Nucleic acid binder design. Structure first.
Length: 1171
DNA sequence: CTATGAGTGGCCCCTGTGGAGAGAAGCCTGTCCTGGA
DNA sequence: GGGGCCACTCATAG
RNA sequence: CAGGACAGGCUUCUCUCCACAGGUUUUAGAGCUAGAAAUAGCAAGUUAAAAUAAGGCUAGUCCGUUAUCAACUUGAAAAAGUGGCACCGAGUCGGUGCUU
């Protein structure tokens, strides 16, 4: 007899809870059959549990890395092109020169020729490096002199130029002076005359650095002898040696040298330079990020112009060289892939290889742009075979206005029931008021159309309250451009103007927008064409031209747009028109609903919107529910599923923050009283852009440094996050702030310095009074006073996870409703055996709180399944003995807490590079670079592990020994291992392989040991805690109340009763401490740490209750699942215990756990490995 | 007399920005509409 | 947060 | 009860593509003098080349960190199938009965 049962689930980023209950709020218990060769044949499990899993990763890192690979590859390709163009000439003077350049990184033994790269002999190399201390000296000497030089010199020069060409941010009488001021900002020197002033500026820096170094050496040796060697010889310290020969930065060097100059007299000029960040500065600095590539282009032009008389090929290929330095892949064409890549959409005019000298000819740029723009366009929900139209299209805005005008019923004198506006009325109103005014209110219509044209002095309007929000913006702009209303009113130009708007919306560039309209050059004058070219439009709608005006109703021959213009007495709007059975439009909608191939559950789940983690979670959830319905006996439940929660906030504050952003910035400027607003016009559409919004927030003063802002400099200004990037991922505006480029590039993963905070706190306080900056934004400035980045600051819940845990309502809804019911009735109406029930967390939260079912996450991982069970019971209840039954249900220790096993994928190892050492644990960077001579990567990640039984040769005697040990397979070797395990094991050094004994052991492969102690295989040589502490509900409640001794929210009576319970049960602390000690001595085995914790507890017996409870909460980290984590107990700090022993699980028993852990196959190793 | 597993503590982790577009989700205001119970 | 590696010490087989 | 689009405003995030600066490692940049050597003293200190996941064949200025994954039988793979129930209790599940 099919019993009636329900299912409850709690969904999170990393967890999936599942629980099945009967009608009486009781979870059924079932005894199953276990597979394997073990003694135990039948075990009993309850029908509750949860599945833990890792968080899904966003693709941002992968996309950034892919862009990095393409960037590096194209850089090397440019280098290769330059090498090809010099190869024919260079081989005449030196054939092996490029061979030396390509083989610099090798050691002398591995090098084929002599170790000196440039000249090949020590004399000329030393002469080079003494004549030119830096490459910029060589650049300057070539650019200013008129003497023939060596081709190697110019090769090194141009190679340096091409590799670091510079930015493209700048495009394209007084303008010459402004350019000179721009260079003056760029270049520290102004007086010296030359065609390559960058070299002059940097050589100036070099000379002053050298002179100041000499002065410091002399004076320091004169006055302070003992610190001389530390400054100029101790590389380990943070002195000059660390600044140059060490890993120290410029700011660190300044910080360390400031006390030295403070204790030292005569440091006036040195302190002045240090306050200007202009002392002892290097060649390669973080300040070069603002260098425009135009300077490099001009210097290249000058050097080629000077050197062209010496070599014909230079003047023959100078245009090509300029192209290489200036060429760039258009941002809309995309990857230049010939079909094989899944990211490409470029169209090929021919089949030749794409080169920077023929890219324009070979690829259809217009078709490429159309393909790029069309990829991300949403398709019509009703006509999947048609595209949406630009939001600035005349037809779309006519749709908007007429739909707004469709439900404008008017009440007059001499009438009884409100009447729809006639089509003639609509047309007259539009032509008389909308074609003349950008914004129209109800007063305008009443006083200008009904009273003036219709002679209806008093008219009442229904369906419009404030005004007609929609506008003829594009129409009015085109009226200003063309000034021909007859052309606009002509219906034979509808297609012409539609393609005009389409072209204005598609292409962002100027050459394309000019080119495609060239066909229509016979319509208007040149000035109209130019102004149209200057015009731009962005955005797309949700409807299609075919629906509104393409298709015609068969019995009437009328379009939907025509119906909107005049629908008679009915005057249906868009929704009634699409939902009216009297027209074939609904039939066309139904027919166009293509019944495409049923997408696989992976495809349906993946085609959704959101992070990969949320679809991973929904896939896990559906797999779990499928397994539960399968095992139960293939009978469907009645009431199931989601808990989904929001905080809706109050409507008033959200509305008031939403309204008047433009007027909010205006009121802020008014409060400050600065004349900025009158200086520069303000527009809400401009406030939509982020950059101008930040500029107006700054009120002309930079946060970091005293500076006067500029409109043009806004392009050079860069937004930086005050909160460090890697420490915490945030793109919120309150975190974001505008600052000058040097300040942004100066600090990476660093909070602003304390001194800057001190000097700018006054202006920041004035901004806070102005209310332009939020309190959190002020706190990011204040974070320096807090002490910088800290552990507790990073331990903050990320908002994206919350967004997703709100986001997965509807998707679960339709997938359950779809797989749930695949059959219809005779009327084709769908009948449901199960109904999806959705509830918010507030109901179950008050259910917990009013009935003492509190929540502590850090006790153990039992809470997910408990919340799922509570969700089930509350969902059943909404649609005494029950509470007692729930109390018993939440008490069993036998809960199928199982973590899913994965094959680790991602990075091969850590990204850092370590110097060479005499060890075997390093990783070669290539197939031929021994880490002994070159270092390499370290700490490679392991993919999974196998248990290998074979014979190994031990000792110098090479005596074979039968062994049974596990060897970890890294991600570096997954393909090799899966390709041919036998050959791989033979090459490694294992002979007589027992292929049947290889067991695929991914991460978290749980191994069961003596006394119920369990361990998950963390890695090839690491283990993590496998058991969990079953804390009784009484201790849970007492601990939660003790932790909340002073912060209970409620009536005084209930709080006082809870306080009395807390104080009367003081002995519970000793009980839980002894329970933790017993659990440790049983499964954790942390005798040293256990003794430390017990000694600290005895020391702190008289401490206040709250601090004790907080510390007890800190203690469960030792007893929690997973890896151990460091924690602090009162004042005492306890280190982590790392299980680096892997000899013990070689004799234990494996248990493979099903997705819910109800079906398992226990396998004994002690029987395996027989000889 | 010397090498090597096994235990404990302390230590280390690549970064930053510009340009261009599209989409999605959330909140609010107004409009109306659609199917039900 | 959490796993990999080296400095230090130490028992045991060869 | 639920959904929709409209238009406006606000906030947040995702997805895809094009560029720029660094950073790290190895080597080149004659180190000198007293002293057999340890050592001592002195001199100099800015730069260059290469690499930036092993590599792969579909050979492209293409791709390589997203997604998927208990065990057994079948299938190359996708995929399909494979495993009893009722009652009483509870410290990692156990106790009783029926049939297989």
């Amino acid at each position: 007899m099919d019993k009636k049962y329900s299912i409850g689930l709690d969904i999170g980023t990393n967890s999936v809870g599942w629980a099945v209950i009967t009608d009486e709020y009781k979870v059924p218990s079932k005894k199953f059959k276990v597979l394997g060769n073990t003694d135990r044949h039948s075990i009993k499990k309850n029908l509750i549990g949860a599945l833990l899993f890792d968080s899904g990763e966003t693709a941002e890192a992968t996309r950034l890395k892919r862009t990095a690979r393409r960037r590096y590859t194209r850089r090397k390709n440019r280098i290769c092109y330059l090498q090809e163009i010099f190869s024919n000439e260079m081989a005449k003077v030196d054939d092996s020169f490029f061979h030396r350049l390509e083989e610099s990184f090798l050691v002398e033994e591995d090098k084929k020729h002599e170790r000196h790269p440039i000249f090949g002999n020590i004399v000329d190399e030393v002469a080079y490096h003494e004549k030119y201390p830096t490459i910029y000296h060589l650049r300057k000497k070539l650019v200013d002199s008129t003497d023939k030089a060596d081709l190697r010199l110019i090769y090194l020069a141009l190679a340096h130029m091409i590799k670091f060409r510079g930015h493209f941010l700048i495009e394209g009488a007084a303008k010459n002076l402004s350019d000179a001021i721009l260079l003056s900002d760029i270049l520290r020197v102004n007086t010296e005359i030359t065609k390559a002033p960058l070299s002059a500026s940097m050589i100036k820096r070099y000379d002053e650095h050298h002179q100041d170094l000499t002065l410091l050496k002399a004076l320091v040796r004169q006055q302070l002898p003992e610190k001389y060697k530390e400054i100029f010889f101790d590389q380990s310290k943070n002195g000059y040696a660390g600044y140059i020969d060490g890993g120290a930065s410029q700011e660190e060097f300044y910080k360390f040298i400031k006390p030295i100059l403070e204790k030292m007299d005569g440091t006036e000029e040195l302190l002045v330079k240090l306050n200007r960040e202009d002392l002892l500065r290097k060649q390669r600095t973080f300040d070069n990020g603002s260098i425009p590539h135009q300077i490099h282009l001009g210097e290249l032009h000058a050097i080629l112009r000077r050197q062209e008389d010496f070599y014909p090929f230079l003047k023959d290929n100078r245009e090509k060289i300029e192209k290489i330095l200036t060429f760039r892949i258009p941002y809309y064409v995309g990857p230049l892939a010939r079909g094989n890549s899944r990211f490409a959409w470029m169209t090929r005019k021919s089949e030749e290889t794409i080169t920077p000298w023929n890219f324009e000819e070979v690829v259809d740029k217009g078709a490429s742009a159309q393909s790029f723009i069309e990829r991300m366009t949403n398709f019509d929900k009703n006509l999947p075979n048609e595209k949406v139209l630009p939001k600035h299209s005349l037809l779309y805005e006519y749709f908007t206005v007429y739909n707004e005008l469709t439900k404008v019923k008017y009440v007059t004198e001499g009438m009884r029931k409100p009447a729809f506006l006639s089509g003639e009325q609509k047309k007259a109103i539009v032509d008389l008021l909308f074609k003349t005014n950008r914004k129209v209110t109800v007063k305008q219509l009443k006083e200008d159309y009904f009273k003036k044209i219709e002679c209806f002095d008093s008219v009442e309007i229904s369906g419009v309250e404030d005004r007609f929000n929609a506008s003829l913006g594009t129409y009015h702009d085109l009226l200003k451009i063309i000034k021909d209303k007859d052309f606009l009113d002509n219906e034979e130009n509808e297609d012409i103007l539609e393609d005009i708007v389409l072209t204005l919306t598609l292409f962002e560039d100027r050459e394309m927008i000019e080119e495609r309209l060239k066909t229509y050059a016979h319509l208007f004058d040149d000035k109209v064409m130019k102004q149209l070219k200057r015009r731009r439009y962005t955005g797309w709608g949700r409807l299609s031209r075919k629906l509104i005006n393409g298709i015609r109703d068969k019995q009437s021959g009328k379009t939907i747009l025509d119906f909107l213009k005049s629908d008679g007495f009915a005057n249906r709007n868009f929704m009634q028109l699409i939902h009216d059975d009297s027209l074939t439009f609904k039939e066309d909608i139904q027919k166009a609903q293509v019944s495409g191939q049923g997408d696989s559950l992976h495809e349906h789940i993946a085609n959704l919107a959101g992070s990969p983690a949320i679809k991973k979670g929904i896939l896990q959830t559906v797999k779990v529910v499928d397994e539960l319905v399968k095992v139960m006996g293939r009978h469907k439940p009645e009431n199931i599923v989601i808990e989904m929660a929001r905080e809706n906030q109050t409507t008033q504050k959200g509305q008031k923050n939403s309204r008047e952003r433009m007027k909010r910035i205006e009121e802020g400027i008014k409060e400050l009283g600065s004349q900025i607003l009158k200086e520069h016009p303000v527009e809400n559409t401009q406030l939509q852009n982020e950059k101008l919004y930040l500029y107006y927030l700054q009120n002309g003063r930079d946060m970091y440094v005293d500076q006067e802002l500029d409109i043009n400099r806004l392009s050079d200004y860069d937004v930086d996050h005050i909160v460090p990037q890697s420490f915490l991922k945030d793109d919120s505006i309150d975190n974001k702030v505008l600052t000058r480029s040097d300040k942004n590039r100066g600090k990476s993963d660093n909070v602003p310095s304390e001194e800057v905070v001190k000097k700018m706190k006054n202006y920041w306080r004035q901004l806070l009074n102005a209310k332009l900056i939020t309190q959190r934004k002020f706190d990011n400035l204040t974070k320096a006073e807090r002490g910088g980045l800290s552990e507790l600051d990073k331990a903050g819940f990320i908002k994206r996870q919350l967004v997703e845990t709100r986001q997965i309502t509807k998707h679960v809804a339709q997938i359950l409703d779809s797989r749930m019911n695949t059959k219809y009735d005779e009327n084709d109406k769908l009948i449901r055996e199960v109904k999806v029930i959705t509830l918010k967390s507030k109901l179950v939260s008050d259910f917990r709180k009013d009935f003492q079912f509190y929540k502590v996450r850090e006790i153990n991982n039992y809470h997910h399944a408990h919340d799922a069970y509570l969700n089930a019971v509350v969902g059943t209840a909404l649609i005494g003995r029950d509470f007692a039954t729930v109390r018993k249900v939440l008490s069993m220790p036998q809960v199928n807490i199982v973590k899913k096993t994965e094959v680790q994928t991602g990075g091969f190892s850590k990204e850092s590079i370590l110097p060479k050492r005499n060890s075997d644990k390093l990783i070669a960077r290539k197939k031929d670079w021994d880490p002994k001579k070159y270092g390499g990567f370290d700490s490679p990640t392991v993919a999974y592990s196998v248990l290998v039984v074979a014979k190994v040769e031990k000792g110098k005697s090479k005596k074979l020994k039968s062994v049974k040990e596990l060897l970890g397979i890294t991600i570096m070797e997954r393909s090799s291992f899966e390709k041919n395990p036998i050959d791989f094991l033979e090459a490694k050094g294992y002979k007589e392989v027992k292929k049947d004994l290889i067991i695929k052991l991914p991460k978290y492969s749980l191994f069961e040991l003596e006394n119920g102690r369990k361990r998950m295989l963390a890695s090839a040589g690491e283990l993590q805690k496998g058991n969990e502490l079953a804390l009784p509900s009484k201790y849970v409640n007492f601990l939660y109340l003790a932790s909340h001794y002073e912060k209970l929210k409620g009536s005084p009576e209930d709080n006082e009763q809870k306080q009395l319970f807390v104080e009367q049960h003081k002995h519970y602390l000793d009980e839980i401490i002894e329970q933790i000690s017993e659990f440790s001595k049983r499964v954790i085995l942390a005798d040293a740490n256990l003794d430390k914790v017990l000694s600290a507890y005895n020391k702190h017996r008289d401490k206040p209750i709250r601090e004790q409870a907080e510390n007890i909460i800190h203690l469960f980290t030792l007893t929690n699942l997973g890896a151990p984590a460091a924690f602090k107990y009162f004042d005492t700090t306890i280190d982590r215990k790392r299980y680096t022993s892997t000899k013990e699980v070689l004799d234990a028993t494996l248990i493979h756990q099903s997705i819910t852990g109800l079906y398992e196959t226990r396998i004994d190793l002690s029987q395996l490995g027989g000889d």
